[PDB]
Design a protein around this ligand. Sequence first.
Ligand code: COA
Ligand code: COA
Ligand code: COA
Ligand code: JB2
Ligand code: JB2
Ligand code: JB2
Ligand code: CL
Ligand code: CL
Ligand code: CL
Lengths: 207, 207, 207
Amino acid sequence: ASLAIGGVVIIGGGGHAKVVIESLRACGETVAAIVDADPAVLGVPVVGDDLALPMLREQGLSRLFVAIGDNRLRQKLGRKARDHGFSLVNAIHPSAVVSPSVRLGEGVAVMAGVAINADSWIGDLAIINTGAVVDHDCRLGAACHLGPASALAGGVSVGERAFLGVGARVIPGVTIGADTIVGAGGVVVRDLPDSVLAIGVPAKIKG
Amino acid sequence: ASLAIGGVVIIGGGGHAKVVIESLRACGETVAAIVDADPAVLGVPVVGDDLALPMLREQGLSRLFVAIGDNRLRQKLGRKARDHGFSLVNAIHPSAVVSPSVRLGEGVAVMAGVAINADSWIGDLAIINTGAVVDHDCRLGAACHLGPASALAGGVSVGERAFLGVGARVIPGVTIGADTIVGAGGVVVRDLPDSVLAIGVPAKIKG
Amino acid sequence: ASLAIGGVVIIGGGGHAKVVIESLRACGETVAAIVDADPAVLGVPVVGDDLALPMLREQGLSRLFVAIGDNRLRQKLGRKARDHGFSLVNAIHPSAVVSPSVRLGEGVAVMAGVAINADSWIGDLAIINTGAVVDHDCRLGAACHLGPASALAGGVSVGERAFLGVGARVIPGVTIGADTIVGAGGVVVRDLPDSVLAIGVPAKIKG
Ligand SMILES: CC(C)(COP(=O)(O)OP(=O)(O)OC[C@H]1O[C@@H](n2cnc3c(N)ncnc32)[C@H](O)[C@@H]1OP(=O)(O)O)[C@@H](O)C(=O)NCCC(=O)NCCS
Ligand SMILES: CC(C)(COP(=O)(O)OP(=O)(O)OC[C@H]1O[C@@H](n2cnc3c(N)ncnc32)[C@H](O)[C@@H]1OP(=O)(O)O)[C@@H](O)C(=O)NCCC(=O)NCCS
Ligand SMILES: CC(C)(COP(=O)(O)OP(=O)(O)OC[C@H]1O[C@@H](n2cnc3c(N)ncnc32)[C@H](O)[C@@H]1OP(=O)(O)O)[C@@H](O)C(=O)NCCC(=O)NCCS
Ligand SMILES: C[C@H]1O[C@H](OP(=O)(O)OP(=O)(O)OC[C@H]2O[C@@H](n3cnc4c(=O)[nH]c(N)nc43)[C@H](O)[C@@H]2O)[C@@H](O)[C@@H](O)[C@@H]1N
Ligand SMILES: C[C@H]1O[C@H](OP(=O)(O)OP(=O)(O)OC[C@H]2O[C@@H](n3cnc4c(=O)[nH]c(N)nc43)[C@H](O)[C@@H]2O)[C@@H](O)[C@@H](O)[C@@H]1N
Ligand SMILES: C[C@H]1O[C@H](OP(=O)(O)OP(=O)(O)OC[C@H]2O[C@@H](n3cnc4c(=O)[nH]c(N)nc43)[C@H](O)[C@@H]2O)[C@@H](O)[C@@H](O)[C@@H]1N
Ligand SMILES: [Cl-]
Ligand SMILES: [Cl-]
Ligand SMILES: [Cl-]
């Protein structure tokens, strides 16, 4: 496991990691290595599992991204990475449009084709996936995930670890609780509590 | 109310105004002032209500944008602005793709991530909101509003002041009447008359 | 029918052709001529029907695009063009984001605002229409058509000549058979066989 000086360490080596790697390279960043629970991905070597993090830090790598789709796991691994002395970078594709009044956390993925409008706040470890739209004055909690082609109208709040499937939509002013799942294509027209699953047009809670 | 020379006056100081301000600045335009019925927004001073328009014109400002979401109101205020001697500019985000055969009116908002294809006609005071798609040979009436992430297939006609909610879709060749509302996520598969509300997949008129 | 040296020949002169012409011009390509079964389109001369292909080749034109929406017809005309000695170019709008690990066939249309992510494979004569999203590890069969604003999540396979209408969505890992149609707005949550029509949220086969 000999590595170049100064690139980004990736936690996770799956399909999401592939996209993240390409976003980072599109920005001229170098990806140093992957750590994966199954101890290459688009040419990036897998050097071990998370027990390899101290070794990576020791050799001077200090920048990291958590490329894990599962929200609760991603959040846990981000904490672990920070404990081990890594800084969480953001992976923002060059094609994404992020308004200058947007507040970004750390460890955030913003994929190709995204637009994020004025005065939106994006928590640590959020994923804003390919082609998603976030309108003005939105609030995205830590470790939430807006799936590909999803869209939030203005003033929408998304709780920690919530997940919106491909093409989900939320109308203005709606609040979605922590740990909630909106199925693919769901159209959310009223506030959703924590820890529910909602599907359909309009979205309805499924027990 | 002392102002710089030569920028754009904005009617409206809400969330839509924020997005419009950022589109204009992204193009290197200067925003001079806001007039708002409640007499700053992202650093632009609110100088009064619409009774301040003559004063603004008198001091040499002549370029204006109406950043009001409500379609009928926007249309009325655009007329008022023109009567007071202002020219209505367009607010086209740099990231929008507007085909070279598109005909644009005046006072049109075209947000980040939009694509508008060949031989489409876009009426005065239309809003083409964030990430929306307008396919070839479309006709958008004055003061209509295509909401974020909405999409029109080819040959679609949208009447004056119609409103398509977040993620609405229209199949090829459909005509939607003036003053009609398509709810968020509605999928329009047949012509809609004037002054109706249609929701669902497929969209159905709700009395 | 006198033509400049070296441009692209277009089969088809309809609305799709208009969009394709503009994509090619946006890349600095020249469009030489159209052949259309009704023997100009945005300034490109219509020189005859497909019986004019040998004459075009004879005068030195060797690059061609098939701008025909109907998938089975497009596929047949692509074969005819190749038999007549033409190379099928791709028509990729400058604004499209095509990952560097994507495999592209020939005769592929990739419209404005598209994003295609890592390790996706795109067959000959596919159409990836305006604003569509193709996530990582997707497989698009020859002559399929992803309509405007459609979206595929990760690991989706689309069979030859399949058609997804405006705003259709497919969840991860789903396979859609050859010659299948997903209606506008359909949300595909399970594999679809060949030669079916599926509509709704979730999409259901209609006999
Ligand atoms: C809603 C969802 C979470 C349900 O998953 P699940 O509980 O494993 O459900 P199943 O696949 O077993 O389907 C259960 C039922 O839900 C229906 N259903 C599934 N997904 C649906 C959706 N998105 N909208 C409406 N109905 C849906 C099914 O048709 C089935 O109905 P039945 O009881 O009549 O058959 C899932 O289908 C989904 O939408 N995932 C989105 C994933 C995504 O986009 N990932 C992108 C990542 S980047
Ligand atoms: C359709 C719409 C206009 C209805 O507004 P409203 O009449 O105030 O309706 P309500 O919120 O009181 O809901 C009334 C009913 O319609 C249903 N409904 C609401 N919006 C719906 C939609 N978009 N699709 C399907 N059903 C919808 C509700 O579930 C409720 O059903 P019930 O009678 O079983 O409860 C609205 O919900 C909508 O879609 N707005 C889109 C706004 C938008 O996108 N703005 C972005 C601006 S840039
Ligand atoms: C599904 C589709 C193929 C059906 O076409 P069709 O069989 O000619 O159907 P019709 O227009 O005669 O409508 C038949 C019925 O299907 C319903 N329907 C039509 N399209 C529907 C859709 N996309 N989703 C749900 N229901 C739909 C109709 O409401 C009607 O219902 P009814 O029997 O209660 O009236 C078509 O409406 C469609 O979605 N086309 C998408 C085209 C597209 O996007 N082109 C873009 C090209 S770039
Ligand atoms: C955002 C996306 O989320 C999902 O992508 P994903 O890349 O996270 O999922 P997978 O392709 O299954 O890959 C998960 C990877 O995550 C690894 N992994 C799983 N658990 C751990 C962990 O504890 N530590 C580390 N270092 N790695 C772990 C797995 O061993 C595996 O290689 C899929 O649902 C995609 O369809 C979706 N694009
Ligand atoms: C396009 C969008 O439309 C809506 O946005 P919006 O910015 O128009 O709406 P609001 O945030 O309520 O702001 C409306 C603003 O418009 C002002 N206003 C309302 N009436 C007038 C008027 O007559 N003249 C002037 N000069 N201003 C007027 C209000 O006092 C208020 O500041 C919301 O529904 C957003 O969610 C949506 N993005
Ligand atoms: C991708 C899109 O597909 C469809 O567009 P399209 O451009 O193929 O369809 P149309 O506008 O009817 O044009 C089809 C053109 O295709 C021509 N055509 C049809 N059959 C042939 C053929 O055999 N050879 C040649 N050379 N041309 C043929 C027709 O004479 C006509 O000019 C429409 O459904 C659009 O709404 C959609 N954007
Ligand atoms: Cl690298
Ligand atoms: Cl300014
Ligand atoms: Cl040309």
